[PDB]
Design a protein around this ligand. Structure first.
Ligand SMILES: C[S@@+](CC[C@H](N)C(=O)[O-])C[C@H]1O[C@@H](n2cnc3c(N)ncnc32)[C@H](O)[C@@H]1O
Ligand SMILES: [Zn+2]
Ligand SMILES: [Zn+2]
Length: 817
DNA sequence: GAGGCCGCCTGC
DNA sequence: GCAGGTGGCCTC
């Protein structure tokens, strides 16, 4: 029944290989694709490519199976084409008796004319390779075979094993107890003697060291003791050392145990590690270090990455140009003597790519574009922004850009009809003009704050996400990026995410998604954003950027669950990072005091920048004028509320005194009196009730009798506090040591994002402070009235986040050609 | 316009 | 129960 065709191509040990085999009437040859029924009779048939044919001297006839992945087993789920397969790095040796039948599969390669094929509207096929852990679709690898029975899955899995393994390279000196090496490699990184290493913060240590409840009634609602926006739980950044030795223990017979590579390093001091502790970091550059003579031995396996640590004085080009011209760059100018707690001089032995033409849809004032420009990858030649103030802001910052103040649907319809100019006379971009496409579609529908998201949008075919995908389909850019709020990935059981990826895959794009935390790229703000990246067939698909700054772990939940499958990005820095966290102090301690209602558009800074972050954002060129440090003019009642929020960390509306106050209005803030009784809540030391509405008990209803107006404690917050976590953070002050909550379009102290009060002044954060929280340069122009400006800032992608993404795209530009 | 008011889901 | 969400809508 089963008989081999020919003789044995190769003969190993127990296994005897062949080239082609014959089962019944069919005949299978290395390369043919086959199907297999599951070990559980229920599931569908599996599909695989035959890699090898052989029989071993104990068990039966065998073959090597390189499995395909069905479309539904990917993140696409049931939105996948039923006939589409995906290449995966999964394979196994199997007995020929499992083969059910031969199967035809076609490779659907993109056309040589793929970039021009957009805008025009029964067999298994594959076009892309899928990574099941990172939800990445990429162009099939070009691993070439010397490999007769060649399995590409085996080839890549072996490459991947030799990459992860710590190996020593060039020897050096054989000592009594160990062998020294000059270099070693790990995760594809070359480490040499004298290189800098990132080490986990526990790798080595340094040789250095009841309220009055009548007056504040709502204070009991702070029993949680959890402080929003606080930096007590953020991890320490990496330890940094200089490789002094790379050595392996020698066995008793003298041969080196190359399974157990160790390194000896010199310890570097961050300022906050010296005796001066945390305040030393306030003014210091985030990449400043101090040399030390302290040494430590650690396992090579503990190295988290390589970095450059240079003596600053010997550098050609200045410290700033050095620090801006590359990743993982640190410097030192002095050494730190721990025993003497002093700073001596360091000992002697311590010594042409053209930019992508970019189209920015829903451009806003230009945060994404600014970030991409800083990364050096793009010129935003075209922007589409329907709202006139933001389009004006974009024009101010981008003079050689063509900014369309048009509905993006209208403008695409004109291009597809063959139009050359819009109604203003502006030249429309055509196929081949657009090489990168980026945009942040409106997020009001996807935001979890939106209580009414079913009223005026429930059709995916007509959403602005689909409009944006139509731009991608039409212009076929080299790179594509879509940004939105985190909830974009789980909205409607993740169908918007699945249909977006499905659409890109149908175009032939490599694509992927992930969630990023802006605070991990250098703003004092928690801001989780979903990012869809795509790359044309001839390109490399970018990776998501590794975190640069440590950040509070609660704010860094970046996993996404799609149909029970949990998905993560490529990011490996999970517990630490090269740079300290950016704080509210870093962000705005240099700004002069202003009042509630501050309207002076151009004032004096009254002093030089104080922190590294302020130095970066204010720029090299001296700036004589501080712009847009203006605040909304809150009413007399709200202003009185703010004046009564304590300055201590964690202060919000729950700390308000229950008093009458005379407002600047001449009017009078009234006292809140606790009428009803909440058995779930109780009563105070005084025995006074804690309810303010007939809703607090049973299944009753709201009546206007118990609703109190003009109260210093806002009535609506005790009214519904039991089901809203006591409205923590409403009228909440920022903390100097902490970070901003997500910066939205209009900072309201009674909004869901209510922690908008200045740490000390009795006002809402200014437009400049919100811009600082978003990482905008101080010279970055906004436009319109103050609410226009707040919206421009709150809508934007933080430029430091966009810059991190942009440098990942730059690596792909350099790796292609 | 400005302030008050305040649902539901993912994730734990 | 706890924590988070580039906010909408309603009334004056
Ligand atoms: C959330 S903002 C994105 C801002 C930008 N990503 C940044 O970093 O500054 C989205 C913008 O799209 C604009 N917009 C809304 N509908 C539009 C449409 N149909 N066509 C063009 N722009 C639109 C809005 O005015 C808004 O400014
Ligand atoms: Zn294999
Ligand atoms: Zn009620």
């Amino acid at each position: 029944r089963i008989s081999w065709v020919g003789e044995a191509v190769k003969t190993d040990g127990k296994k005897s290989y062949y080239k082609k085999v014959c089962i019944d009437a069919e005949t299978l040859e290395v390369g043919d694709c086959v199907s297999v029924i599951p070990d559980d009779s229920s599931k569908p048939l599996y599909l695989a490519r035959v890699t090898a044919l052989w029989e071993d001297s104990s068990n039966g006839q065998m073959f090597h199976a390189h499995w395909f992945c069905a479309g539904t087993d990917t993140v696409l789920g049931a939105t996948s084409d039923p006939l589409e397969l995906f290449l995966v790095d999964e394979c196994e040796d199997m007995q020929l008796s499992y083969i059910h039948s031969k199967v035809k599969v076609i490779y659907k390669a993109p056309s040589e004319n793929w970039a021009m094929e957009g805008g025009m509207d029964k067999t298994y096929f594959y076009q892309l390779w899928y990574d099941q852990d990172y939800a990445r679709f990429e162009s099939p690898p070009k691993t070439q075979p010397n490999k007769f029975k060649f399995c590409v899955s085996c080839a890549r899995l072996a490459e991947m094993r030799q990459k992860e393994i710590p190996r020593v390279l060039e020897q050096l000196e054989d000592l009594d107890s160990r062998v020294l090496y000059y270099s070693a490699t790990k995760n594809g990184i070359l480490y040499r003697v004298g290189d800098g290493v990132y080490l986990p913060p526990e790798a080595f240590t340094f040789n250095i060291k009841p309220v009055d409840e009548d007056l504040y009634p709502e204070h009991y609602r702070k029993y949680s003791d959890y402080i929003k926006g606080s930096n007590l739980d953020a991890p320490e950044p990496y330890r940094i050392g200089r490789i002094k030795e790379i050595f392996c223990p020698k066995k008793s017979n003298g041969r080196p145990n190359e399974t157990d590579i160790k390194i000896r390093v010199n310890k570097f001091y961050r300022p906050e590690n010296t005796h001066k502790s945390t305040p030393a970091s306030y003014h210091a550059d985030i990449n400043l270090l101090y040399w030390s003579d302290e040494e430590a031995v650690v396992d090579f396996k503990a190295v988290q990455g390589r970095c450059t640590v240079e003596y600053g004085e010997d550098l050609p080009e200045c410290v700033q140009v050095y620090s801006m011209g590359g990743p993982n760059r640190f410097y030192f100018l002095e050494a730190y003597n721990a025993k003497s707690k002093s700073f001596e001089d360091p000992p002697n032995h311590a010594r042409k790519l053209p930019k992508l033409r970019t189209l920015d849809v829903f451009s806003g004032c230009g945060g994404l574009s600014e970030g991409f420009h800083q990364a050096g990858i793009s010129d935003t030649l075209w922007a589409i922004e329907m709202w006139d103030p933001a389009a004006q802001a974009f024009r101010l910052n981008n003079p050689g850009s063509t900014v369309f103040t048009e509905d993006c649907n209208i403008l695409l319809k004109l291009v597809m009809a063959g139009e050359t100019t819009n109604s203003r006379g502006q030249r429309l971009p055509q196929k081949g003009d657009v090489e990168m496409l980026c945009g942040g579609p409106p997020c009001q529908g996807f935001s979890g704050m939106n209580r009414f998201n079913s009223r005026t949008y429930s059709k995916f075919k007509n959403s602005l996400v689909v409009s944006f995908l139509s731009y991608c389909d039409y212009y076929r850019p080299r790179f594509f990026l879509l940004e939105n709020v985190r909830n974009f990935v789980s909205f409607k059981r993740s169908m918007v995410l699945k249909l977006t990826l499905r659409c890109l895959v149908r175009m032939g794009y490599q694509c992927t998604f992930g969630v990023l935390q802006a605070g991990q790229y250098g703003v004092a703000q928690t801001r989780r954003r979903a990012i869809i990246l795509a790359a044309a067939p001839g390109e490399k698909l970018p990776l998501f950027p590794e975190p640069l700054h440590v950040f509070a772990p609660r704010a860094c939940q970046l996993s996404v669950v799609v149909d029970d499958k949990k998905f993560v990005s490529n990011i490996t820095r999970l517990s630490s990072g090269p740079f300290r966290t950016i704080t509210v102090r870093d962000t705005m301690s240099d700004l002069p005091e202003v009042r509630n209602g501050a309207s002076a558009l151009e004032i004096s800074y009254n002093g030089e920048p104080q922190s590294w972050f302020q130095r970066q954002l204010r720029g090299a060129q001296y700036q004589p004028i501080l712009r847009d440090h203006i605040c909304k003019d809150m009413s007399a009642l709200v202003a009185a509320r703010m004046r009564h929020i304590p300055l201590a960390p964690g202060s919000d509306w729950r700390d308000l005194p229950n008093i009458e106050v005379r407002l600047s209005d001449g009017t009078m803030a009234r006292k809140l009196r606790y009428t009803h009784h909440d058995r779930k809540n109780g009563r105070s030391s005084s025995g006074a009730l804690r309810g303010v509405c007939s809703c607090v008990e049973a299944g009753k209803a709201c009546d206007p009798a118990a609703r109190q107006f003009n109260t210093l404690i806002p009535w609506c917050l005790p009214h519904t506090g039991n089901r809203h976590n006591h409205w923590a953070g409403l009228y909440g002050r920022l903390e100097w040591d902490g970070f901003f909550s997500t910066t939205v379009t209009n900072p309201e102290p009674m909004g869901k994002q209510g922690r908008v009060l200045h740490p000390e002044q009795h006002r809402v954060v200014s437009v400049r402070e919100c811009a600082r929280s978003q990482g905008f340069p101080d010279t970055y122009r906004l436009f319109g009235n103050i609410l226009d400006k707040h919206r421009q800032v709150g809508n934007a992608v933080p430029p430091p986040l966009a810059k991190a993404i942009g440098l990942e795209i730059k690596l792909c530009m350099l790796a292609k050609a």
